[PDB]
Curated annotation (Swiss-Prot), chain A:
Keywords assigned: Cytoplasm, Endoplasmic reticulum, Isopeptide bond, Phosphoprotein, Ribonucleoprotein, Ribosomal protein, Ubl conjugation
Keyword Phosphoprotein included in the entry's annotation: yes
Residues modified to Phosphoserine: 127
Organism: Mus musculus (Mouse)
Sites of Phosphothreonine modification: 155
Record's compositionally biased regions (Basic residues): 158-168, 175-185
Cross-link (Glycyl lysine isopeptide (Lys-Gly) (interchain with G-Cter in SUMO2)): 116, 161
Subcellular location: Cytoplasm, Cytosol; Cytoplasm; Rough endoplasmic reticulum
Protein name as catalogued: Large ribosomal subunit protein eL18
Curated annotation (Swiss-Prot), chain B:
Gene Ontology CC, one term: cytosol
Principal location: cytoplasm
Taxonomic path: Eukaryota, Metazoa, Chordata, Craniata, Vertebrata
Family: Belongs to the eukaryotic ribosomal protein eL20 family.
UniProt-recorded name of the protein: Large ribosomal subunit protein eL20
Subunit-level organization: Component of the large ribosomal subunit. Binds IPO9 with high affinity.
Originating species: Mus musculus (Mouse)
GO molecular function: structural constituent of ribosome
Swiss-Prot record, chain C:
Species whose genome carries this gene: Mus musculus
Residues bearing the modification N6-methyllysine: 4
Compositionally biased intervals (Basic residues): 1-25
Gene name linked to the record: Rpl29
Protein's job: Component of the large ribosomal subunit. The ribosome is a large ribonucleoprotein complex responsible for the synthesis of proteins in the cell.
Residues represented out of the complete protein: 2 to 69 of 160
Phosphoserine sites (modified residues): 30
Family as reported in the entry's similarity comment: Belongs to the eukaryotic ribosomal protein eL29 family.
Name the UniProt record assigns to this protein: Large ribosomal subunit protein eL29
From Swiss-Prot, chain D:
Species of origin: Mus musculus
Any one GO molecular-function label of the UniProt entry: structural constituent of ribosome
Keywords noted in UniProt: Cytoplasm, Endoplasmic reticulum, Ribonucleoprotein, Ribosomal protein
Compartment(s) where it occurs, according to its Swiss-Prot or TrEMBL record: Cytoplasm, Cytosol; Cytoplasm; Endoplasmic reticulum
Name the UniProt record assigns to this protein: Large ribosomal subunit protein eL21
Known role: Component of the large ribosomal subunit. The ribosome is a large ribonucleoprotein complex responsible for the synthesis of proteins in the cell.
RNA sequence: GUCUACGGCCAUACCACCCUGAACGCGCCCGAUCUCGUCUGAUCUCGGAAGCUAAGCAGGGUCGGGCCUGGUUAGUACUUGGAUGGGAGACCGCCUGGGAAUACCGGGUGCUGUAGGCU
RNA sequence: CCGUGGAGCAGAAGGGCAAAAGCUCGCUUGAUCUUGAUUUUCAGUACGAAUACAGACCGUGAAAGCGGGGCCUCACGAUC
RNA sequence: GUAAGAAGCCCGGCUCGCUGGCGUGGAGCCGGGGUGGAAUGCGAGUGCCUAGUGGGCCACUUUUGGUAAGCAGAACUGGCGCUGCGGGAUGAACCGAACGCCGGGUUAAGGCGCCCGAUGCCGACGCUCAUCAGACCCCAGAAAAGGUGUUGGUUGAUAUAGACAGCAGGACGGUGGCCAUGGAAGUCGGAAUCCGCUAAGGAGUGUGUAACAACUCACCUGCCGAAUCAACUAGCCCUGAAAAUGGAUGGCGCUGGAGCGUCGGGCCCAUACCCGGCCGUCGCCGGCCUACGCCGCGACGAGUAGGAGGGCCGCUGCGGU
């Protein structure tokens, strides 16, 4: 017949967190994505099940750049996860944004520009089908854990940052990193 | 080949596909004994491949028809030509049978070959089947019946019903 | 204590369990191993393109838009 | 234990064919090889400078680099587990064009010509290929000649 | 009209063939297991319709020892569509009870009714692939008369082989 | 219908013998002062134009030898898959598909890419 | 005079070579520097060997070109 | 091994320090227009962590060493180990077939005299008699050779111009011929080998004599009177065929078969197939009824080492209740 090794979908359908507010958000967005037949509702429901790693914190300057693109004048920026303040920029536009657990340093920086922010329940009350929205997400591969990954730190094209106890001289440098001692990668 | 049950006569005509080098093939015909038309066509293909450069892919069968006996009510004598294959080597053979139908004579030939020589139907090639007169019958077992006013009893007839009156006070007379 | 030396039995099954699919074919595969002179010429042609492109190509685009 | 080598077991693979020895024909040099064309690899014994490995003999691959006296070919070599796209630098003495790509180009040219020509006439021409369909019902002819009877020949040693 | 002039007439080769799986699951080579999976014949004693082409003929010849294929009849197709008819509007096997089930999934081509489905199956044309793929592999029961020499080819006296006109007599007992 | 110069295929066009070659051309051929090199102007190099198709060369012929192609060998030797097929084995037959070569016989034996001189 | 490789190419064999890779002659060290990528056992790690390039200086022939060792397949070695 | 398209083709224009007679060639970029391109089947791609393993064996086929091995060593595929179930009496690998718990029907392989379910069919054709019958891949026994024991076949030769068998008669002359010698007078030897009357007799097929004699045969004929002789070939059976506790078609037994070969119609049952109920997993989901709950449909459930999830299974103690 047919093998049963890939018949079970490994994706998760229930948030492992026990946060009551997150549970209520899931209970609301599940009904929305089930009824309104909105792919935006579907994807924002799927992004709520994700873990801490799959929900990277989007910075403020990245969202500034994403909103500065043409066609994002009055559209609402939606970030499933935490948006953090950026100290590298000095001036910010109106920036009407809806996110989850906005940092306090960015709270004042956004409220002083004149733009108003709102939460996920307010977003659902305002635009159920998700009209006039831009879904943004932070750098998922920007995590440091993804820099130690690859094929192997021994192949001549590794650039994979092998695990080292302490960084400096005489620490994984002699045999396999230079042509003087042994070989070069 | 199985030759299960009774055999059947099939006239099978066939020719190669029309090729640009030459068209209108000679359209060779054969007379095959087989239980059904499928194995009839298979045996025809086998024989025409063994005879000439013809195969099932490069050739085709035009017509395959059941052939009925021209006189099913007449007792006839048939001379069968065999090209059978034994355990040591293959040999030719001429046999004679007495039956009403050509298919019946071929069935008798197959059964008699399989019984007397342990030759399976895989290695039996029926070469020629022709009705012969009583004067050209060389076999004594068949020639002993070409006598009018033939009379013989049926002595020591079996009971054939041993188990219907399985328990009885009788002893069969058998006469 | 003689033992078995080398066989390749029960290997095609192990391979076909995961798959022997072809490598990922993608556009713009790579530029490694290419002639260094050719690569230098390509870099020069790419970096000197915007010097004359944004004017003559724009004029030709306006011309063909006026044509159709 | 099998004496792995660079040219082990090519006694008949890298040898020149019968009655074809001597210097290389000059036609194989004047052939043009550009980047992206599909070519074939066939090891030649007349020259031994840039001959490929015995595992790439008879392999078909596309060209990714061109130099003075050689070409760079991306060949899909099937290692025990998977397939690797390997870059090989082989001279032009062992490389010839692949007629499969030429036939495909001729077919696509015929197709884009046939459709461009039939668009005006409005006839939906069937330019898509198909397998060999079963032949339709045809009428044979015997012209009065009786079909010849075939009989198996008796066995004779 | 051809036999009047003493000339034979050959019909066209049937463009549709019913294939049934005969052998089991375990103990099969991958070369034939892949073809059995591609023919939608996974479990034993199930049958599907195949459009006969140069590729399909060789695909059936590759797995000949594990299949029994033949040329289905109109009544056999009717029975297989009515009694054992199951279509998949989604990844599930829904029984064919109402014409709306066919008109919703396959009505975009003009096969709204089950009669249209039977016609498209028996008169293979431009929209045969979709109609054949919409039908779930026909799960057939075991035969009544008993299969003779399951491991042997039909020509030798078995059942696993080409049964061009004799496959209907087996379909009558399998369904 | 042909040749020369440069070439692709590299014996259908190579080998041995025998016949023909008008007008160009190829060459044979006549001579070592300069360029050049050997024992030798034989060979390679600067001077030709007294004779020739004797030779090379180009065509034609051999119930020619080779080469290519096609029949025969032959659905024959082999071979993919199958059987609770035979035989004690060696091996063989059958079903489904593909299908070789030597003997023997018959047919051919150069086609063309660019520049040029002739009838 | 015949002579298609029946000799020779340093050495065990295989492949390859004829105005040649064989013998002779004349100049010569490209058997020298440098960074990468690639092939071969491969875990596609290293060593060894080898391929095609590129950047300077030279050899050779008139020149196109060839040469960064031996016509090719072995002739060789991490840490400290 | 490659290709069977939109990552492709046609068109126009720019860049090059690459190459270069040439606006030449080749790469890169931009711009607008035109997807239906062999069949069949399927949802794919990708990242991280990672236990166990690192002694294997068997089978069809191809093969290396060996005389051979249930020996050692290889290639593809399958199986056991990782595996139950129906047949092979018995069983690791054979034949079917793969495994949740059940009811009905059917079947694969195999079988239908009794053990033991089903031939208790008025089953068909033919072979076979053993004082050692025979009875189903692996599998558990056998060869060369032989049979005037039967049953088929082939090549041949004779016979009303009366054969083959049987009874009876003849079986002579040249010539006790040529080489031998103690004896060879057809009969121990070498080479030869004819002739005449006949109806036929062979320089003679064998027995015998030291040799001669004698019997007998090839050959012809008399009586009877119509088929017969010889050599091969292959099916059963038989000889060939001898091992040690009493004993193995599984046993009883079986001979107009319960044996061998070819088959027909029925019948017997597996965890296999079809229909239906129930349990669980997965997928698709349905509803604003513990949402961590409540439903609906479809397809699948075996498994050592190992990896995960659930437990309203269980033991002890602590904070709340
Ligand atoms: Mg499982
Ligand atoms: Mg997994
Ligand atoms: Mg080991
Ligand atoms: Mg029944
Ligand atoms: Mg001088
Ligand atoms: Mg001088
Ligand atoms: Mg001179
Ligand atoms: Mg001359
Ligand atoms: Mg002359
Ligand atoms: Mg000749
Ligand atoms: Mg076989
Ligand atoms: Mg040598
Ligand atoms: Mg040699
Ligand atoms: Mg250089
Ligand atoms: Mg051992
Ligand atoms: Mg072994
Ligand atoms: Mg174990
Ligand atoms: Mg397993
Ligand atoms: Mg098992
Ligand atoms: Mg059992
Ligand atoms: Mg089998
Ligand atoms: Mg099996
Ligand atoms: Mg049951
Ligand atoms: Mg059975
Ligand atoms: Mg009973
Ligand atoms: Mg015996
Ligand atoms: Mg047994
Ligand atoms: Mg034993
Ligand atoms: Mg006998
Ligand atoms: Mg007994
Ligand atoms: Mg199941
Ligand atoms: Mg399980
Ligand atoms: Mg408790």
């Amino acid at each position: 017949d047919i093998r049963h090794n890939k018949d079970r979908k490994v994706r998760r359908k229930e948030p492992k967190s026990q946060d009551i507010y997150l549970r209520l958000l899931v209970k609301l967005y599940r009904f929305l994505a089930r009824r309104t037949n909105s792919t935006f509702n579907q994807v924002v429901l799927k992004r709520l099940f994700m873990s801490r790693t799959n929900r990277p914190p989007l910075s403020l300057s990245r969202m500034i750049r994403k909103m500065k693109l043409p066609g994002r004048e009055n559209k609402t920026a939606v970030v499933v996860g935490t948006v953090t303040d950026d100290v590298r920029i000095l001036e910010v536009p109106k920036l009407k944004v809806c996110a989850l657990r906005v940092s306090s340093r960015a709270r004042s920086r956004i409220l002083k520009a004149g733009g108003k922010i709102l939460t996920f329940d307010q977003l659902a009350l305002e635009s159920p089908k998700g009209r006039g929205t831009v879904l943004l997400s932070g750098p998922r591969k920007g995590r440091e854990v993804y820099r130690h990954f690859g094929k192997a730190p021994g192949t001549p094209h590794s650039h994979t940052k092998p695990y080292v106890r302490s960084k400096g001289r005489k620490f994984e440098r002699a045999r396999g990193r230079r042509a003087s001692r042994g070989y070069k990668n | 080949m199985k030759a299960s049950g009774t055999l059947r006569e099939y006239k099978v005509v066939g020719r190669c596909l029309p090729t640009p080098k030459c068209h209108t093939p000679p359209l060779y015909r054969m007379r095959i004994f087989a239980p059904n038309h499928v194995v009839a066509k298979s045996r025809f293909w086998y024989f025409v491949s063994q005879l000439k450069k013809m195969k099932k892919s490069s050739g085709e069968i035009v017509y395959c028809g059941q052939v009925f006996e021209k006189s099913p009510l007449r007792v006839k004598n048939f001379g069968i030509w065999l090209r059978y294959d034994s355990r040591s080597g293959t040999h030719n053979m001429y046999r004679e049978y007495r039956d009403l139908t050509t298919a019946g004579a071929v069935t008798q030939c197959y059964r008699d070959m399989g019984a007397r020589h342990r030759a399976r139907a895989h290695s039996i090639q029926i070469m020629k089947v022709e009705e012969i007169a009583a004067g050209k019958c060389r076999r004594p077992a068949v020639k002993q019946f070409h006598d009018s006013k033939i009379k013989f009893p049926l002595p020591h007839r079996v009971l054939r019903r041993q188990h219907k009156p399985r328990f009885t006070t009788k002893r069969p007379n058998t006469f | 204590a003689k033992s078995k030396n080398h066989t390749t039995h029960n290997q095609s099954r192990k391979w076909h369990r995961n798959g022997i699919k072809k490598p990922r074919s993608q556009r713009y595969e790579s530029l490694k191993g290419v002639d260094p002179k050719f690569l230098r010429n390509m870099r020069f042609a790419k970096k000197h393109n915007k010097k004359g492109l944004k004017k003559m190509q724009a004029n030709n685009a306006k011309a063909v838009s006026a044509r159709a | 234990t099998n004496t792995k080598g660079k040219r082990r077991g090519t006694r008949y693979m890298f040898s020149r064919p019968f009655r074809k020895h001597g210097v290389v024909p000059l036609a194989t040099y004047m052939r043009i090889y550009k980047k992206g064309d599909i070519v074939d690899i066939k090891g030649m014994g007349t020259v031994q400078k840039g001959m490929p490995h015995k595992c790439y003999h008879g392999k078909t691959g596309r060209v990714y680099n061109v130099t003075q006296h050689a070409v760079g070919i991306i060949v899909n070599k099937q290692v025990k587990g998977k397939i690797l796209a390997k870059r090989i630098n082989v001279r032009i003495e062992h490389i010839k064009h692949s007629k499969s790509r030429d036939s495909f180009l001729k077919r696509v040219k015929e197709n884009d010509q046939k459709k461009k020509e039939a668009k005006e006439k409005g006839t939906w021409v069937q330019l898509k290929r198909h397998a060999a369909p079963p032949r339709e019902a045809h009428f044979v002819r015997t012209n009065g000649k009786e079909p010849e009877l075939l009989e198996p020949i008796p066995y004779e040693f | 009209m051809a036999r009047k002039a003493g000339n034979f007439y050959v019909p066209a080769e049937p463009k549709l063939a019913f294939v049934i799986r005969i052998r089991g699951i375990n103990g099969v080579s991958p070369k034939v297991r892949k073809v059995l999976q591609l023919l939608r014949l996974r479990q034993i004693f199930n049958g599907t319709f195949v459009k006969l082409n140069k590729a399909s003929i060789n695909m059936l010849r590759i797995v000949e020892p594990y299949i029994a294929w033949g040329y289905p009849n109109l009544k056999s197709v009717n029975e297989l569509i009515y009694k054992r008819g199951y279509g998949k509007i989604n990844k599930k096997r829904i029984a064919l009870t109402d014409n709306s089930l066919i008109a919703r999934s396959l009505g975009k081509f003009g096969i709204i009714c089950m009669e249209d489905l039977i016609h498209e199956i028996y008169t293979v044309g431009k929209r045969f692939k979709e109609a054949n793929n919409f039908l779930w592999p026909f799960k057939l029961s075991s035969p009544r008369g008993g299969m003779k020499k399951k491991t042997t080819h039909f020509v030798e006296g078995g059942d696993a082989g080409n049964r061009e006109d004799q496959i209907n007599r087996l379909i009558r007992r399998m369904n």
